[PDB]
Design a protein around this ligand. Structure first.
Ligand SMILES: [K+]
Ligand SMILES: [K+]
Ligand SMILES: [K+]
Ligand SMILES: [K+]
Ligand SMILES: [K+]
Ligand SMILES: [Mg+2]
Ligand SMILES: [Mg+2]
Ligand SMILES: [Mg+2]
Ligand SMILES: [Mg+2]
Ligand SMILES: [Mg+2]
Ligand SMILES: [Mg+2]
Ligand SMILES: [Mg+2]
Ligand SMILES: [Mg+2]
Ligand SMILES: [Mg+2]
Ligand SMILES: [Mg+2]
Ligand SMILES: [Mg+2]
Ligand SMILES: [Mg+2]
Ligand SMILES: [Mg+2]
Ligand SMILES: [Mg+2]
Ligand SMILES: [Mg+2]
Ligand SMILES: [Mg+2]
Ligand SMILES: [Mg+2]
Ligand SMILES: [Mg+2]
Ligand SMILES: [Mg+2]
Ligand SMILES: [Mg+2]
Ligand SMILES: [Mg+2]
Ligand SMILES: [Mg+2]
Ligand SMILES: [Mg+2]
Ligand SMILES: [Mg+2]
Ligand SMILES: [Mg+2]
Ligand SMILES: [Mg+2]
Ligand SMILES: [Mg+2]
Ligand SMILES: [Mg+2]
Ligand SMILES: [Mg+2]
Ligand SMILES: [Mg+2]
Ligand SMILES: [Mg+2]
Ligand SMILES: [Mg+2]
Ligand SMILES: [Mg+2]
Ligand SMILES: [Mg+2]
Ligand SMILES: [Mg+2]
Ligand SMILES: [Mg+2]
Ligand SMILES: [Mg+2]
Ligand SMILES: [Mg+2]
Ligand SMILES: [Mg+2]
Ligand SMILES: [Mg+2]
Ligand SMILES: [Mg+2]
Lengths: 46, 317, 44
RNA sequence: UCUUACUAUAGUCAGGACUAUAAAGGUCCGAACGGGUUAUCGUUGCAAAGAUAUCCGAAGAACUAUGGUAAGCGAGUGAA
RNA sequence: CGGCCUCUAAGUUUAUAAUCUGAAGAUUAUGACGAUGAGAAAACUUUGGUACCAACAUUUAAAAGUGAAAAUUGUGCAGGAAGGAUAAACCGUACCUAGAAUCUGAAACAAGUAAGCUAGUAGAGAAUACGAAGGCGUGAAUGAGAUAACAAUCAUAAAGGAACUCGGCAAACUAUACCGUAACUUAGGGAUAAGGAGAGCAUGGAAUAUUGUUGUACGACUGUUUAAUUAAAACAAAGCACUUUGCAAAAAGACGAUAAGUCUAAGUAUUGAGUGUGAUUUCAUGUAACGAUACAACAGCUGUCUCUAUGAUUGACUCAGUGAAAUUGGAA
RNA sequence: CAGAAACUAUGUAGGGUACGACUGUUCGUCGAUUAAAAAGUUACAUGAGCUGGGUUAAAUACGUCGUGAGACAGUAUGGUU
């Protein structure tokens, strides 16, 4: 079953993994942004 | 009459077996070792993921490594180009070297450096490297550039670094080099030494030999007699920790302090990650028994005179 | 954490070195020991 | 952000006993902490792994914190 | 009094240079960036033991004791960072810490989560017991009755004491600086062996506090293992054995759409890797020690049982409030 | 069929047919009592009544078979009813 995998989670690791600067600054992260941007997402990251 | 806690026999220390993990612990006796810290400006820390057996990719490339004690690397001089008398200040213990190191001091300038100490070397001993040539006083006393007899007596002392050419046949050396201007590569480990078999010399009919070739034959610690350069450096002596190979760790936890992790046999694995699980071979298919030689065929040894003697699996004792 | 995690992060939420200004303007320079020297040429 | 290994920087382990040490032990009894031996309950549960008692380790191959590295044609990590 | 700021570690880099490469990219050096670390002064202020600030131990702000801080000295081996230095801006400050309204577990969940302090008595103690302050005795997410069967969690028990049962499962018994201690033994142990003992019924509660002893099988031992049905005889292990590795530009091994190159290693045959074995003793086998392993015997112990009874609480039952679920072709 | 005991057969199922040891089990075997310690059917009568001795696993060791992966009405320990 599901586990409490977000117990003890910090919001600094959330910005380093799924932040905006982690994506504009990488070739593979620019694709995720454009995809979410082309779909209409407001929350492109974090 | 009561037996002491430390039981000294031979040159190996044993302790009272008051625990099952200290019964088989055996240590060599080296009480002369410097009990303080090393010369810091000659050391640097050994940290990072390379300590864990990882290469620049981050993936495990060396198995059974990681989790050992914090260490520092000792910058040891295996070239010894600088000439002049050097005074041994203290013999120290290096975690990353089997043999012991000596912190020498140049009497001319006072700069200190490390060198693999010989068997029997102690503080106060004066060592000298004649790799950069012979001084004027020594050269002038004989009156000739090279005299095969007097030179050996004044310079072939324990701990002196000389070209293999200047060393007489039958001398035991422990920092044998390969290239004319290369560092010591052979016999650097503890207790290891190499004898000089012969030299490419000619007779002048006056009883004085003179060098005519560019190489010399030396028997390495493995027994291989190979061609070594004429200017290759070599220190007279044997490495300090002769009894290193007689030690015993006694418990599994002392192997983990030495940065060694458990070795899982191939039989204890599944067939999905080892040929054995579920002839002897490694996890990747390399024959582990049968005499298969892993030296690349296209790499021929052009310096081999007498190769190593293969045991062919026969038991020794 | 379900929903609040998805809002825009502010300085009143985290403390581990996260700094964010209010665009009040630079009135000086930072020193090497953590102080601040007010350049009165930038003060308005 | 789980978890496995490694990595850097840090923290923690009441008290007592034995042993050659004031400090040298994968030593001993036993809290914190870490485990999960046996039984009972629970099974649309308080809980998609809990409660109670009992049991094991507790200066070490220990445990914990904040970051880092390594995973998906090949297989990462693996005291397996 | 933290951040910001300066410095750097593990590392990151669509930064630059060089190099390798089907493209994507990768490597090395430099730079930048990167805390979980280091950063002048203040009840006024702006070389390498001539060492270092890992673990452990010791000493030190002089009335005594205690706990830090920092330093002093020393011990063991497993041999213990880096770099920089050395007239008051901007941001944080509310509340919540999980038994009573806030974090994670789908939620108002009997679970989980970091640091400091955390009265006193009594103790060797952060054990066990009481509890000063404080908080609480849930948001009707309940309350008042009654005290059947039965269930859960418990208490006591005549005589007997494993007759229960696959099986002693569960439960119960087990109880101070003392005199005396065996075979065996790797000479450390076994060993706290055993055996002798510490006014009224009781020097009295709780915890300490647990069946004991002996002999076998397996594994030397402490450890590890299927998170969440198998904790072990399995894995590991120290020790031992064998094969391979000479380092002259690539030591072997591992990795690299695939190379430069990296780990090995700032190592060098007493090194590294791989393979099997699994201390020592005798050369697969016999002992000391150890085991929440499996099994047998002996002693005690008890509701396991002959054979159940009674007592306690919470449910079950009734009244008031709130109000589910699986399920269902249609039903006399 | 002298008596007693026992044998064979005819009526008759009212009530009884216990307890323990060793055997994984019922198969069985034995111990000592007893008037006697007989059988069968009911989905093993009965697990939305209990047990798990069983009914099936993944772990591990040994044995046998197979070139091997594996197999076995094998053996032993462990295993959410
Ligand atoms: K290895
Ligand atoms: K092994
Ligand atoms: K298997
Ligand atoms: K203990
Ligand atoms: K490319
Ligand atoms: Mg999962
Ligand atoms: Mg975490
Ligand atoms: Mg090994
Ligand atoms: Mg396996
Ligand atoms: Mg806040
Ligand atoms: Mg906060
Ligand atoms: Mg910052
Ligand atoms: Mg993590
Ligand atoms: Mg211990
Ligand atoms: Mg113990
Ligand atoms: Mg576990
Ligand atoms: Mg139920
Ligand atoms: Mg401030
Ligand atoms: Mg920086
Ligand atoms: Mg910080
Ligand atoms: Mg709660
Ligand atoms: Mg609580
Ligand atoms: Mg909640
Ligand atoms: Mg409260
Ligand atoms: Mg109330
Ligand atoms: Mg009774
Ligand atoms: Mg009685
Ligand atoms: Mg019975
Ligand atoms: Mg019985
Ligand atoms: Mg019991
Ligand atoms: Mg074991
Ligand atoms: Mg499990
Ligand atoms: Mg279990
Ligand atoms: Mg052996
Ligand atoms: Mg190579
Ligand atoms: Mg084995
Ligand atoms: Mg064996
Ligand atoms: Mg154990
Ligand atoms: Mg009602
Ligand atoms: Mg008659
Ligand atoms: Mg009648
Ligand atoms: Mg039946
Ligand atoms: Mg039924
Ligand atoms: Mg199997
Ligand atoms: Mg077999
Ligand atoms: Mg078990």
């Amino acid at each position: 079953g599901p586990r409490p995998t977000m117990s003890g989670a910090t919001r600094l690791v959330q910005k380093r993994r799924h932040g905006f600067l982690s994506r504009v600054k990488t070739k593979n992260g620019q694709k995720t942004l454009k995809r979410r941007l082309a779909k209409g997402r407001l929350r492109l990251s974090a | 009459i009561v037996t002491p806690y430390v039981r000294d026999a031979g040159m190996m220390r044993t302790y009272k077996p008051h625990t099952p993990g200290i019964r088989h612990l055996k240590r060599p006796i080296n009480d002369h070792l410097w009990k303080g810290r090393p010369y810091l400006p000659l050391t640097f820390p050994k940290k990072g993921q390379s300590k864990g057996g990882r290469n620049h990719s981050g993936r495990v490339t060396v198995r059974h490594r990681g989790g050992g004690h914090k260490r520092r690397i000792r910058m040891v001089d295996f070239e010894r180009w600088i000439p002049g008398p050097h005074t041994v200040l203290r013999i120290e213990y290096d975690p990353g070297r089997s043999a012991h190191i000596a912190l020498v001091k140049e009497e001319a300038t006072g700069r200190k450096s490390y060198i693999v100490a010989a068997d029997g070397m102690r503080a106060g001993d004066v060592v000298q490297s004649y790799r950069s040539g012979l001084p004027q006083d020594l050269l002038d006393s004989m009156g000739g550039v090279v005299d095969p007899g007097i030179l050996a007596a004044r310079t072939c002392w324990r701990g002196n670094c000389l070209p293999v050419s200047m060393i007489p046949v039958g001398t035991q050396i422990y920092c044998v080099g390969s290239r004319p201007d290369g560092k010591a590569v052979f016999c650097r480990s503890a207790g290891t030494y190499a004898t000089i078999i012969s030299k490419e010399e000619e007779t002048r009919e006056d009883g004085t030999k003179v060098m005519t070739g560019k190489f010399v034959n030396v028997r390495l610690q493995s027994g291989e007699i190979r061609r070594v350069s004429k200017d290759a450096c070599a220190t007279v002596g044997i490495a300090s920790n002769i009894m290193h190979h007689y030690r015993q760790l006694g418990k599994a936890g002392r192997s983990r302090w030495l940065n060694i992790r458990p070795t899982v046999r191939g039989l204890a694995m599944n067939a999905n990650d080892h040929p054995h699980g579920g002839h002897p071979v490694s996890p990747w298919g390399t024959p582990a028994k049968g005499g298969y030689k892993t030296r690349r065929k296209s790499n021929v040894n052009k310096w081999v005179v007498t190769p190593r003697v293969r045991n062919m699996g026969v038991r020794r004792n | 954490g379900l929903k609040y995690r998805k809002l825009r992060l502010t300085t009143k939420d985290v403390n581990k070195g996260f700094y964010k200004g209010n665009r009040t303007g630079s009135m000086g320079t930072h020193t090497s020991y953590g102080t601040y020297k007010i350049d009165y040429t930038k003060v308005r």
